[PDB]
Design a protein around this ligand. Structure first.
Ligand SMILES: [Ca+2]
Ligand SMILES: [Ca+2]
Ligand SMILES: [Ca+2]
Ligand SMILES: [Ca+2]
Ligand SMILES: [Zn+2]
Ligand SMILES: [Zn+2]
Lengths: 92, 92
């Protein structure tokens, strides 16, 4: 089975709905990261009330330092959220 | 629904099975990228017979230039594969 076919499809929907919420048509704006953290990753990621973490997360994820998260690094954000929930249960 | 819960779970399985195939326990080695492209992304991504593209993809994905793809950029790879299948259908 292509487990990756589930993710690629599950994200293109949440990626385009948010990245496409505003901007040209495929770029992530803070109003999505903070809104996506409180709306999507709100069951696994605490709903930040201050973009502050979103200000720090961008410092760890923003590679071009654009203050925004294109699709290449935006995914890398879920990976940073997915990695914490993966190393935690596997805490040797 | 947390569509992202599907991806995070769908990847932790393919991410740990490959990233955990060899190495410490959570790092991606070429033997996974080329093997993951021919085994997982083989229905959407052509099965490369030459790591050559994997040699070029790493040049576009490897940020630390480690010749390997940690979990933060490894995900960014699927995003580069997911983005091509997302902008193609949305080719205005
Ligand atoms: Ca946007
Ligand atoms: Ca960015
Ligand atoms: Ca590995
Ligand atoms: Ca790297
Ligand atoms: Zn789009
Ligand atoms: Zn692991």
């Amino acid at each position: 089975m292509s487990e990756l076919e589930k993710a690629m499809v599950a994200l293109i929907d949440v990626f385009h709905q948010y990245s496409g919420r505003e901007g040209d048509k495929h770029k992530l704006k803070k109003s999505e990261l903070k809104e996506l953290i409180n709306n999507e990753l709100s069951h696994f990621l605490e709903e930040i009330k201050e973009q502050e973490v979103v200000d720090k997360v961008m410092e760890t994820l923003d590679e071009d330092g654009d203050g925004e998260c294109d699709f290449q690094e935006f995914m890398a954000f879920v990976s940073m959220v997915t990695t914490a929930c993966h190393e935690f249960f596997e805490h040797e």
